[PDB]
């Protein structure tokens, strides 16, 4: 209960209402009451991070077609 | 500071109450009193931001019920340099 | 820029709000403030048609609920040379 | 700065926490501490109104559960030249 | 200006708008724009405490719906003299 | 022209599409390309408020379905002089 | 030629497959490989228009299933001179 | 040491028990015993952070059930340089 | 002063907040801040095991709900000489 | 030989394993290691098509369970002369 | 020595814990700490084969629950001579 | 100004109406009048994108019901340098 | 550029837009704008075949809903050496 | 141009028709006529990609009904160096 | 290399597609094209066994659907010295 | 039919 | 510091592990080793209170399952001056 | 050659069949035939990796049904330089 | 490296696999391979002890499923001077 | 050598066996035999990490069946410089 002059937003005053109820972290000149009273995840998306945090080769194509000397 | 508090009122008696309240509440400077016309008087103060918020909440409460009343009570934390030409630098 | 944007308001506190909003919103030039009488104040900006359109739209929203309010928000893309005699060249 | 921040507490422990949480939080100077009597201790900070309010807020939040509790948390944005005599202007 | 104000955003477009709304909302000084990696951009302002609070509420409202958005809006009214080593002094 | 238009995209292929679309659509000036991180690329154009508005509208439609897509399309008619330190003067 | 093919991929292994495919399919020149960030790699080719269309349809099919994949495959038949500043002239 | 421990108690007997326990439980120095008023006595120790924690926890256990008991037990691992002026340097 | 405290956070805003809380809460010097890629930033402190165990507790409390949060809060009470090459020196 | 075998992995530990596995398994020479960004590391070898086929099979199996794993394994029996510019010649 | 041990982690805080445990457990040498991007930080140690086995075992256990954790612990008793050109010699 | 605005009408009386309306509505420049054939007349204005947009909107309404009427009202914010050869530099 | 591309329109306004979309869609060269009589206007481009095809698809989509509309969009990849006499070489 | 377009039809007559058509339709050069045998005749055109695609399509439409028919009309964007030697490479 | 690769096709157009594919895909020399009779064309490619395997597979996958099609795709890793006298050493 | 390189539109190309 | 930490074990092997795990763990000095008889060995360490708390926990975990194990792990933050005579100063 | 192929068989007659099947199958050299003892005979071939792959598969299929059979069929694409000393160079 | 590793195997193919895996795993020098009789072959390696342990653990794993398999895998860290005479000693 | 290897035995005969077995199995130094009391004797050896691993394993196997037996077998691959005081330099 702050007493004395109040820096929190009031009905009559105009132009100081910006971001009044928005919660802004840290030392706040604005009153706790007007602004209001644990993030564990990475919000942004990186395509590599988003997907998963077998061999493509020339040899792979046209398997059915080849005839010749087999290999292993 | 460069923040701007402005209190408009319907008369000079509600404006002088507001100027006294504002300039006693916080470390603000009275930069002007303007007679707009129609019975509208504006008292403009210039201080740091918190100072001007406090002053303009002190002025509004004071003059809300002195004379014909309070029209506006507005803080502009930074003013374009353009707007400074239309603003009073001293109260005479 | 030759376009004119003009915001009329009931009082000076809304007009100062509109002038700050306008000068900040675009590359307009605060060209004058006029005390009409009856508590009407007209702020006038001159810039390109794109600039003035952007500025007046912002000024109309800024000062719509500051003090008594907005009377008019208007844009004249080109003023006749006759009209430029009754327009302020610089703010006073 | 000439704003004053005051936190009254029931006991000395709750006022050394408030005094510490104040001066850390914002740009304020601890001007003194007073033993009012009856188990009340008042910690006062004088600083710019640019940050005084902040310290009071932080300190109050901190000492409200320390010890017996908080009694008062008051901000003054300008102090009259005569209250200056009843306020501790201390290297302390 | 010893208070620090900081907005973190998912992208540079919200960060530039935040830097614009922060620097036009109060007498703050834009000191740093950092690419933190991963699409985190932090615009840092340094001004008096009220100026910074006004600037950071304005920046957060400006960049909340621009691009991916606001990650954090945070004010620190007095920064330890050691955290000032890891703070940029001029935007590059 | 002083206005800023900025298109953020997920990747560089959409950004090159948006830069071509923007430069072609209006008389804007491609002023820089920035690799933010996390696969965000910001293209920035500077022109008159009418030019930049026309350009960014075209760039938003051009690169909306090229590669990963558009993150943000934004227009700042006037940037604060502080913000111009964190804006690229020429493309690199 | 001056047409521009651009293939973005999630990795350098799908990008090298695409560059090889594109630069064997038609008479196109590999002008650059850019690491955007987030694992995004862009291979940009410059050729005549039909050449670049063929090359970018050869690259896309090739890398569609190599590594993490293909993000974009985009032809820009003429590029503004503005966009040429943000484009790589050689691949080193 | 730079840490501060403080135990407020209702009377002097709980406080002498707290001081004895605290000063035997770890390497802390009794720097003050203060009759606050209203029957509150505060004992202060300055030591390393680990000693003050061991000491304050010991003092709380010893005086909890002696006399009128404990009001507060608090540790400030680093008091601001300004809080030092409001703190005793040796016992009375 | 041989122990290390380390807070990793998701962003620079949570990290600066933790750095402030840590340096204010105990006798620890801020030795460095590292951008790790992917949006991780790490704030390292160096002090005694109690100073540091008190700082890292205070820091994790500060930045837990700030921005994207805290990833790690670790204390190493004695750092091997070899590990000091990979550790930022105190001018950072 | 002028064939190209390339393994992309999520992190450096899986890639150093792939490079070692490959250079132990066949007559290939390691020519590059690339940090693509966002945790993609591409290891590249140039040899004969039989050697590279034998090398990339052994390398892909080796790194599949090391760390975050294998993203891509890819052989290019003949690389166009144009892709040689974007291909590292010796490991840096 | 020529054995190489590599502990990749998600963040620098789990890798400074892993590096401390590795260096203390056995006579290894931090030969480099790498930021791979994506958050991945690799700690590479080179010592005798007996030492490296002991060190990596200690490192993997230490950093498993620290921060975001362990991705890979991997020992190569002897890398190929071509895999040594993509290995750091000294930490940066 | 580089933008083009063009009003095509069936006849010359609507075209003269549209040219007057356009020149009066904004700061555009009447750059030519063309008799296409089949009773189509094209008036072309050059000004800023904001100016031309304002002018063509007015010209479209002015000449919609004068004589035969409006065929087309069109705005090209930027014309390719090739197209400027088929555009009249001055009216004839 | 031996390919010819031709759009015929009912009016000059669609023809000018077609000339703008054609010359900005590919490396074509605008060579002729003819008034054919009767409100037929033919813009002719000359470029490589792919450039011309891209240009004429872009011109046709651009001028389809501008004014009266598109009469014909037609490409001729090689023109007989005799049809080149009746083709203009520079737009007048 | 290095591109090759080929058409094989059953019979010399469809082939001659298609080849003549190609020469006329696009900028391609008839390198050769080869009698595959089996009553298959192939006519080859080597030209820049543009002309080649258009010509091949035209010849295919052209000789389709003439004689027995069109077996195939392949288009090669870039011939590999080796294939040229097999190809007819002569005015003959 | 001595490995032989061979693609018989029904026509010369599928064969030329195969020769191109084989040569581009792998390091193989085109040793001949033979008109067998009956519309069968063979393409023989002599290189190293892995190279020839890659070449034949790429060629078959290419000419499989072009024209009448693929009759045979065969590899003979060593041909007897007798089968050499019936193999063309260089292409015509 | 159309054979060889496809210059035709493909869903992927933009 | 004057804190005592005291691990006791059944045998000397568990004790050397405890001593080494206590000394590597924190900034503590091994002040002695005692053979008490009956299998018992007591390693004693001295340092600041947090140094000792982190060492005596590292020691206990290290030697818990080595040899016949741990009997006692105990911390005393300050010892009476009479207990200093029955405590060794330096190891023998 | 660099690749090693090896067929172990129970008896010489199975091994001679494998040596013949392997050497006929691909371009490999019979570098040794060794009587290991106990009726185990190893046939060893050194060629390119592709040939040795094809050869060893031919040998294993041939000798499996001959005599007592095949014990093993192994390919080492590049033996260590140390294993060369224990490998035959020419059969005896 | 005066340690010895040995791997007996049933047949030579398993032994060459063991020698190769051993000399590829750790810093061990192949000294000899022996034919014991009854089908037994013994490969011997020499290096630092940990290196020999890693080498022989990796050789056993590799040779265990090749051929008739592993008979024994042993390490003698210090061989007696007498045993050196019965040991191969022939890397050279 | 700075690795320690300690075997604990019940009685001296098992310890002398361990000393002998450890000293003959590896190039380690017997540094001391300690009578811990309660019939526990610790043999401590010092050498490189591989020699100490081999030696301890040898000692344990050797002493497991001599007398009352083995209580412990332990390695400290790096030993803190503090523990070198409680460790015996030479057997005496």
């Amino acid at each position: 209960i702050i007493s004395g002059t109040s820096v929190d937003a009031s009905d009559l005053v105009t132009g100081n209402e910006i971001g009044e109820q928005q919660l802004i972290s840290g030392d706040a000149y604005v009153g706790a009451q007007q602004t209001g009273c644990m993030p564990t995840d990475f919000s942004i998306q990186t395509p590599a991070r988003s997907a998963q945090n077998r061999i493509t080769g020339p040899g792979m194509l046209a398997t059915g077609l080849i005839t010749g000397t087999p290999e292993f | 500071g460069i923040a701007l508090g402005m209190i408009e009122t319907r008369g000079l008696v509600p404006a002088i109450e507001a100027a006294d309240a504002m300039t006693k509440a916080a470390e603000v400077r009275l930069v002007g009193r303007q007679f707009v016309g129609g019975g509208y008087v504006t008292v403009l103060v210039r201080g740091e931001t918190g100072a001007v918020n406090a002053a303009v909440r002190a002025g509004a409460d004071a003059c809300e019920r002195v004379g014909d009343g309070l029209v506006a009570a507005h803080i502009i934390a930074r003013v374009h340099s353009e707007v400074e030409n239309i603003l009073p630098k001293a109260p005479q």
Side-chain angles (χ1 to χ4, degrees), chain A residues 38-54:
Chain A
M38 165 62 182
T40 63
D41 297 308
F42 266 118
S43 305
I44 21 80
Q45 255 65 244
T46 269
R49 160 188 268 96
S50 76
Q52 301 104 9
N53 275 164
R54 50 188 311 269

Side-chain angles (χ1 to χ4, degrees), chain B residues 6-87:
Chain B
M6 313 179 263
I7 279 172
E8 196 163 26
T9 44
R10 281 171 273 266
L12 183 61
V13 171
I16 296 161
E17 164 64 312
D20 185 72
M22 290 201 285
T23 326
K24 281 169 164 183
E27 198 167 18
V28 293
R29 87 181 146 275
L30 195 59
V31 296
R33 176 278 333 284
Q34 283 284 328
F35 295 109
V36 173
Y40 270 157
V41 187
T42 299
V43 271
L44 299 94
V45 290
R46 296 288 290 279
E48 304 254 50
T49 307
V52 166
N53 273 245
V56 174
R57 277 214 66 177
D61 264 17
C63 65
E64 184 185 4
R65 305 135 196 279
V66 173
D68 255 294
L70 173 278
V71 173
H74 192 273
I75 305 118
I76 292 180
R78 200 170 198 165
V79 264
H80 207 273
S81 33
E82 290 279 11
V83 182
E84 303 273 31
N85 302 315
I86 73 148
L87 292 181

